[PDB]
Design a protein around this nucleic acid. Structure first.
Ligand code: ZN
Lengths: 161, 85, 51, 93, 137, 55, 134, 67
RNA sequence: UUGACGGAAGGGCACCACCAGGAGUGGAGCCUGCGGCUUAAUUUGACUCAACACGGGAAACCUCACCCGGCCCGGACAAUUGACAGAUUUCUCGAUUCUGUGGGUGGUGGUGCAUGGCCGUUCUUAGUUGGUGGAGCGAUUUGUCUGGUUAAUUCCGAUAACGAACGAGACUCCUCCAUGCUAACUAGUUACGCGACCGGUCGGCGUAACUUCUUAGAGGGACAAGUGGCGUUCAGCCACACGAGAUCGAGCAAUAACAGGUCUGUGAUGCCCUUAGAUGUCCGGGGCUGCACGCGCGCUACACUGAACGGAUCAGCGUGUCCUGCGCCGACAGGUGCGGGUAACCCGCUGAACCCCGUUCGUGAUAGGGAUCGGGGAUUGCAAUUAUUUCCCAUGAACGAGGAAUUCCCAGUAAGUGCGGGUCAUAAGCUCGCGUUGAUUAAGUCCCUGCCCUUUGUACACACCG
């Protein structure tokens, strides 16, 4: 017996902890968020990833490991939670997917101008009206530099953002 | 007599399942009471923007509105349903 | 508190960021150039305790 | 330094399922999953640390909790530690 | 009790309540002050008759009040010296003993739902005084 | 007698018996609506919980 | 044969139940001249002193008030009584008598028939009130 | 501060140059015309556009507008 | 040539500027924050706006990072455990610490001048940038402007530019109505019966009508629309009629910058340092509260436009597993039993305060002021001494509107007044909100102080901290 004010907050805290756990876990799997559909009978978790073959194990063991890790963390009964890995289309129109694609080119040590310009055109060809990539931090020197890459038009103020 | 409580954070999806519940039950010749709209609850959280003490006393206000509608007769994500007797 | 903040207190980097080798190199920013199933343990604990 | 009874209770639970979770609370009296057995929560997080340092388990973290997963090297090690045949498998396989 | 001035009503009802010498009037009416936020005792000697006349008047308008309600009705501002002033409830024992005194006159009884309400006898006595203040004005 | 002395200080109230559920921080904690998270981590997960800025 | 018209101050909502009968004007059961603030007693009697008692001698008015403060309820009561008679003279009397009442109440003070939308402004951080700062 | 943005004025001129025969000197009539011949995502923007159309319609009847 | 800057000129804007004024602050006491002193330690960050009631920092322990004492390993990975007795002798655990050589690990340890992320500030000022065309060998320039107008590079207009993009606006949430819809036994009204009192009162009881009041969905409504005047009779402004309104309050917020803040918010983080006689970690005690003082936000006042005593009478925001209602006990603070509410249901018709109406007080350091101290009663907690708060009695200080200076503010605003939330075992002089009462002055100007732009100058370009 929990009040509605604490229940809706507890529902949002669960989705916040579930999303962040899957970022540190499915980082190299193209994770791009989740959709939690809670029903009075059970709860189903929909994982959005650009590489679903890696979200699943060699024979589907990682998906079994995630649903077994969620039922133990959040007190879900056995067989009460189900995870459905889904494939998101138009990867260029996903800011999280393109941030991962850029991060895995930086740790490879290619560049910040050739890498961001390459990921800036993949987003423009994907049907985007505008993009903006900002890379800040230190690299090869003590002082930090901010490399900003813009393309198209970008709305900054107002509700449409 | 069954009272169906509907609580959600978005009025569009809350009234979408509310209309389908009334319309879905009106075709069964069930005398239903109209959707009673409870006063909305705004979960106020006024925090400090800066993670330190150097900000110019700039606070940011958050809101989490919880709309509640009950149906007394004789589902989309984000909507809670609870039936009673 | 420092007297002259803009004056770098290091001989390795100024206040203005200065790239190494003009941005060229592997781990650098980039130069301005042309580049474009059998039973589990629960069942085993029963078979070993039934004898 | 944990009792041998508590040393195998952590591994049996880790082998019963395929995952192991534990809140980062060295002062928690009993583990939420090992409630019937008087296993301190510190023994669970410290026994899984020895497995991670030998390539047997990979871990994660969600704000207060560890998420341990038995790897192929760890399943075979517990299979010999618990004296089990190659026939048994964790619940995630 | 309406249709007349409520400030002269409690003054004439207290005179009727004092002339009818049947009120309890506990022994500590000379030492107590009516609230912790008060600095001095009431200036009037017969404050127990003035409060009893006003208390039974509140029960006529809003029944089922109880001691916790009359403590809130007769509350006020509490000066905290160099600190800002806040609201402070009245005295609980003064509000409780004045409620039991009205019950001895059969004008107040225990409300079945909440606290204490007004009796048909008290409703009659209050309307008689309400008629005297109207004719005398 | 170390087992009867280690972590034997009574922690049932105050700022020491509670911490942020996100980073184990004890300062700037938000106890309203059962959040139990520091004021710096709530701004990070405000959208994920459902707290939006309207005014 | 009765109307129910409301008058709104800042937060004082006074609803007058203008019903046919004799010249009865009461607020929460108490007479109109018995409201606690005696300084604002003439503000409550403006609809009666301007229109005359002969226009109110055929309708009973029972105002119920809640919200706001003492002064807000005063301006809400006199507004409810002003509009309740207008709405009564519109549905049960001819429209010519309605204009004969409105032109008297509007020319004196428009706040008897039109509520002012002035409400308290929200407080901003960094200041003690809406406008003032630290 | 009653100056119209270029969004209000440009959209009002295109409506006139394409639907001059439907517009008039009444705001509430032009308010319903612009609601149909133009998909305006807001109602305040529609009232600003239709209100400036009524202003320009009073200028056409006296002479040519430079826009 | 473009920036940057100037102690050059011109123009423009803004109650974080002025004018006209209001409330003050600076003076008093006290509460707090920062220095300075002192200290086994008085942790520390931040120092013009853009530090100083700030780190949501109201610290009894914990927090805790400081100080002085004692354990503990929570020493990955490649015999040893505890313990009765008392100020040293035995027993117990059983491969789980085995000691070393390896070289992991954790920090509220340093570095915010190694960084991320947020945030503050420049500046919420109006600024910024492509395409095509034009000028130039070119970097670049024009568009992006003399002027008028606008809250606004907002528009009109001028026009080698034309057409656009970001910002502004629009947009989002808000309150102002709509007796028109949609509906309400967790909201009410009205008509009814019932019944207490002398046709009036009744939040005193009951289920039929239907939505005015209440709640909240949808759709309407306002757009300088109408009129007059001023204006390139353009952009707009002013004044009026109508009307719920004739500039409503947030949020969001460009290009670009800071050596701005934050490693003490992060299992964000590089490096350095400490690693078991520890800068890990636990448990005690103390400190952050220490006081010749110099300041910064505040509260209470200096009264009769008032203090008291008593009567009467009105809110809204919001919270609740803890919020609290009734019957008893007590002078108060309390206590106690029975209850309700995971909530439009119970607290609760939130009987708030100021205010209003009586009653005494009568230039008076006074029934103004309640600071400083004494003696007691309680509550919170493991424990309050350096008084946690709270109550009662007593003690009755400075302070008679406050120097040079200086702050905020244009309508439900200032100010007064109380309430709620955050902090919270105990808990507001702080802050975030809320309603209540409710003005004076102003519809203006570059005079001051701040930035912006143009022109101009430069040996500056790490850009005058040159
Ligand atoms: Zn946190």
């Amino acid at each position: 017996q929990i009040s509605k004010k604490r229940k809706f907050v507890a529902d949002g805290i669960f989705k916040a902890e579930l999303n962040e756990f899957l970022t540190r876990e499915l980082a190299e799997d193209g994770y791009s968020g989740v959709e939690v559909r809670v029903t009075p009978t059970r709860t189903e978790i929909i994982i959005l990833a650009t590489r679903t073959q890696n979200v699943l194990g060699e024979k589907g063991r990682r998906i079994r490991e995630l649903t077994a890790v969620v039922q133990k963390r959040f007190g879900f009964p056995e067989g009460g939670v189900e995870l459905y890995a889904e494939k998101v289309a138009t990867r260029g129109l996903c800011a999280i997917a393109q941030a991962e694609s850029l991060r895995y080119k930086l740790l490879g040590g290619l560049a910040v101008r050739r890498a961001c310009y390459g990921v800036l055109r993949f987003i423009m060809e994907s049907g985007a009206k505008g993009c903006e990539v900002v890379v800040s931090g230190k690299l090869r020197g003590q002082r930090a530099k901010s490399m900003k890459f813009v393309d198209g038009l970008m709305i900054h103020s107002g509700d449409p953002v | 007599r069954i009272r169906i409580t509907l609580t959600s954070r978005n009025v569009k999806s809350l009234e979408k399942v509310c209309a389908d519940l009334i319309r879905g039950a009106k075709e069964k010749n069930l005398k239903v009471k109209g959707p009673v709209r409870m006063p909305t609850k705004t979960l106020r959280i006024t925090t400090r923007k800066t993670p330190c003490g150097e900000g110019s006393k700039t606070w940011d206000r958050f809101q989490m509105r919880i709309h509640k509608r009950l149906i007394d007769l004789h589902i989309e994500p984000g909507v809670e349903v609870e039936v009673t007797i | 508190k420092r007297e002259f903040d803009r004056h770098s207190g290091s001989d390795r980097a100024r206040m203005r960021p200065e790239d190494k080798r003009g941005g060229s190199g592997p781990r650098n920013w980039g130069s301005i150039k042309e580049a474009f199933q059998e039973m589990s343990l629960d069942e085993w604990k029963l078979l070993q305790d039934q004898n | 330094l944990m009792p041998k009874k508590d040393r195998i209770a952590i591994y049996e639970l880790l082998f019963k399922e395929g995952v192991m979770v534990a809140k980062k609370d060295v002062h928690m009296p009993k583990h939420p999953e090992l409630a019937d057995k008087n296993v301190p929560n510190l023994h669970v997080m410290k026994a899984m640390q020895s497995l991670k340092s030998r390539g047997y388990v990979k871990e994660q973290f969600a704000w207060r909790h560890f998420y341990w997963y038995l790897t192929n090297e760890g399943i075979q090690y517990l299979r010999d530690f618990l004296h089990l045949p190659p026939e048994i498998v964790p619940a995630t396989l | 009790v309406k249709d007349v001035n409520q400030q002269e009503f409690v003054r004439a009802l207290a005179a009727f309540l004092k002339k009818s010498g049947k009120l309890k009037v506990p022994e500590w009416v000379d030492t107590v002050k009516l609230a912790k936020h008060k600095e001095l005792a009431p200036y009037d000697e017969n404050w127990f008759y003035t409060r009893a006349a006003s208390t039974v008047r509140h029960l006529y308008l809003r029944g089922g009040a109880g001691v916790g309600s009359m403590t809130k009705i007769y509350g006020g501002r509490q000066s905290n010296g160099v600190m800002p002033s806040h609201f402070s409830r009245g005295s609980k024992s003064v509000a409780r003993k004045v409620l039991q005194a009205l019950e001895s006159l059969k004008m107040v009884d225990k409300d079945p739902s909440g606290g204490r309400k007004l009796t048909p006898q008290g409703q009659r006595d209050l309307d008689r005084i309400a008629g005297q203040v109207a004719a005398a004005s | 007698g170390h087992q009867q002395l280690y972590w034997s200080h009574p922690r049932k109230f105050g700022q020491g018996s509670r911490s942020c559920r996100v980073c184990s921080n004890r300062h700037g904690l938000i106890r309203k609506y059962g959040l139990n998270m520091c004021r710096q981590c709530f701004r990070q997960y405000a959208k994920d919980i459902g707290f939006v800025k309207n005014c | 044969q009765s109307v129910q018209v409301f008058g709104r101050k800042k937060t004082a909502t006074a609803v007058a139940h203008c019903k046919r009968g004799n010249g009865l004007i009461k607020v929460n059961g108490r007479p109109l001249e018995m409201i606690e603030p005696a300084t604002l007693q003439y503000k409550l009697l403006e609809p009666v002193l301007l229109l005359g008692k002969e226009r109110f001698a055929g309708v009973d008015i029972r105002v119920r008030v809640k919200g706001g403060g003492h002064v807000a309820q005063v301006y809400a009561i006199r507004q409810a009584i002003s509009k309740s008679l207008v709405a009564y003279y519109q549905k049960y009397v001819d429209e010519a008598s309605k204009k004969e009442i409105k032109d008297i109440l509007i020319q004196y003070d428009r706040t008897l028939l039109v509520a002012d939308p002035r409400r308290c402004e929200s407080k901003k951080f960094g200041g003690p009130g809406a406008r003032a700062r630290y | 501060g009653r100056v119209r943005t270029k969004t209000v004025k440009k959209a009002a001129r295109v409506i006139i140059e394409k639907y001059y025969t439907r517009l008039g000197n009444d705001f509430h009539t032009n308010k319903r015309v612009c609601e149909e011949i133009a998909i305006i995502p807001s109602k305040k923007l529609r009232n600003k556009i239709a209100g400036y159309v009524t202003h320009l319609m009073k200028r056409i009847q006296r002479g040519p507008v430079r826009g």
